[PDB]
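Sample entry as discussed:
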Amino acid sequence: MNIFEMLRIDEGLRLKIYKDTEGYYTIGIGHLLTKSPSLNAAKSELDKAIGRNTNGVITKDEAEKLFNQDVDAAVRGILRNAKLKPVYDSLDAVRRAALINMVFQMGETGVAGFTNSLRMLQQKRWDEAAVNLAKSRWYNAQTPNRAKRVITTFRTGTWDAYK
């Protein structure tokens, strides 16, 4: 398992325009198109990303290129974040993969705001960190089950949540 399989697992794949948990236009493997209520806007945003007239639908390979780009930016976002980077440096390979999962899901900015948990990860207090992570809208309301998976990864440093 690696970050690709992991997010592939958490996000799925859809070749047509869709609405994520918060009613936002998304496509492929979690590609957020636009916070904008307009399907048109979502379409125009899409055609731009892909570089063609999609009519709102893409190919598998097209999903896959957006995904590579997205995993890449995540990682880079982390590396540029003053707040995120040192956490990241301290983590093992599995655990960074969860860190990257949350960044992909709620941005660097959203993530860099879980200060508390971040220190606790930094300091290797897995259990405390999981508990702290759990007190979130993320966990509580947003995406419970996926948050539990990611939460568990951070705890165990295993992919057990993934099989």
